[PDB]
From TrEMBL, chains A, B:
Domain of life, source organism: Bacteria
Protein name: Sugar aminotransferase
Keyword annotations from UniProtKB, A to Z: Aminotransferase, Transferase
Amino acid sequence: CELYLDSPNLGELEKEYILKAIDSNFVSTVGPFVPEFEEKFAKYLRVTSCVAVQSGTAAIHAALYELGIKEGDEIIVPAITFVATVNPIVYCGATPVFVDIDKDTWDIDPKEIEKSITSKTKAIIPVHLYGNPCDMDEIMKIAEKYGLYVIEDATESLGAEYKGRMTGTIGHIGCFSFNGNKIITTGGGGMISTNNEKWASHIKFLVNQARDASQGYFHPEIGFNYRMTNLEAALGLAQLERLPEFLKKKRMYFEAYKKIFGGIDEIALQKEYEGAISSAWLPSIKIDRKKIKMTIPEIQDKLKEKGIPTRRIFNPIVDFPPYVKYKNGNYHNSYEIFENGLSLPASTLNTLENIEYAAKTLLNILGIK
Amino acid sequence: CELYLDSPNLGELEKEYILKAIDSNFVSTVGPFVPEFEEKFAKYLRVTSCVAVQSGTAAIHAALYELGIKEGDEIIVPAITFVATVNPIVYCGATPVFVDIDKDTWDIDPKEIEKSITSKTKAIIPVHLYGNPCDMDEIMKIAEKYGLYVIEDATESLGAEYKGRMTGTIGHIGCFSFNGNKIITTGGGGMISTNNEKWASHIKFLVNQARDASQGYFHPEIGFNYRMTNLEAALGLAQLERLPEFLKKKRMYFEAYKKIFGGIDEIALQKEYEGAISSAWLPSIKIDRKKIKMTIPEIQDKLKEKGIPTRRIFNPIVDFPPYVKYKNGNYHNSYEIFENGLSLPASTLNTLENIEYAAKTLLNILGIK
């Protein structure tokens, strides 16, 4: 019937698990759903430790904070990502260093990472953009050579793989989102993943207001209220049971687009690195508009008439007022993808026929056969 | 049957409202439950504007941030409160200034506020401790005289009144919590209250990642992911319908304690200022232990044997390692209340007979008649 860009997929299992929380009275800080969801999620990723938090933004904040990021530190990030990749650098008092993206993968270009390293660089936040893993063997090699931490922004990439390893398990710390449009949702929520048990323990302590559990209201350091609630965790357990089903659907939609755009010179889907498997959170394309002479917003209005919802690519962060002081270089590939890019519908509510209809209608609107 | 210190009170209305959210697919950022809960809450408080956020900590952070609190600013706070009153000052880069509390009300002592004002003071965060309103006519008079903002930490005080005005509507901005133990819960959540519509509009924008709604992913300033979710708001609407019932129960429990401790020289309940009505979140007492020669933890173990749960008073924040640099003065009254104080059970799950049993058993354990 209807095409959905990124709507969540909720039904009877979610209702059941949420009613179990209300009935147990475990909806808040204390309860068994949070540690159950932490352990089931860490098992899915094949990582030692996970900590459940209130958002993906909080996950990235807590990861940088745990790693001791502070004023004077430089943190390298792509120019194309959601702004919540970068804001946490500024929360810590650190300096973002923006680098351009690969023209085919749309991910942080490691050659641009290496050119931007200084005596002040402490970390890299690669983003698995639209669920597409970054060039992690090269990123990790650069980080090892310069003594840098790697924080994976895996928020769009739950289920994506890099050479048989789940995203979020390669860097020093991984960060996930369970916001409404992500491949699973808790309404709001996120997760920290790490193989360092000490980092994971200290982060769980910090996101629970740094309260000494052996005392009453005694706090040995400054913390945060960043914990996931048990209400959210009960929903996240239901969604995690369905995650394999959802990723099958995402990968199917992506393959349906990869086919109908096949051999069409004017449409380039985002490309995977060899050995990587995208989660295909939002199959996204670059359009060669030279022959077409329509803008993306014109293409989007034509699609909207046909009941096909879309979204533009993240704006280049270097043109936001707080970040333009850090605009260093042309960011040619970032601008090409923003100017010519479009994200296509991929809610797990969709049928294969809906996706095929979307891809075929776009070819009509663009006057291709 | 069982006495409960502060457990939430959830049943069929909460289940109904939460299932309406899951069924509508509105569990995340977008949806009608958040603005419905904002408007119903603002009507309950008789204030122009409310913004729903992810915690009480976030509410206080966003309030200080909105008011332009920054490095070099001094913010006056009580030495006895939950640490999340103070942490947000440090999140903003500002300096906390700790002052002692009134020996009878346990609230921020306005004479100590005035002695601690300097050329750098920008704001005061009075705390309505255990739901007991502060001396707001005097606090507001001091703030007017020195050009200071007043941010009410009303997190424990939903339903409390000051001279016929609801707490959170007196200062420039009010802050509420819906954590599991508060008088209502959304699992996790909070609320900003203000009569300044511009402050409320800019705060709602900031807690939604400062995204320009007229564009796609364009952010004109640094924001936060601090919004309440629609799942949380659907639960908060159910609880808000029951708030009058719950406050009746809280005030009943408090009056039951006020009676059985009546004329007993060794037990002093927290006192209200003339014209104020506590929400009695946790009826809390100071014990004259000179004749009794038991510590509070000894008294708590005796109560625990009788199935009476209790909690100690918030620790004095000036003895936490990050804050001891700001310990300026003796804080005599803060230490007296911590050393001799105890919080008594007041979950809205309790019966009047449970409370009477608790109060009477304490008199036995203390060897009073």
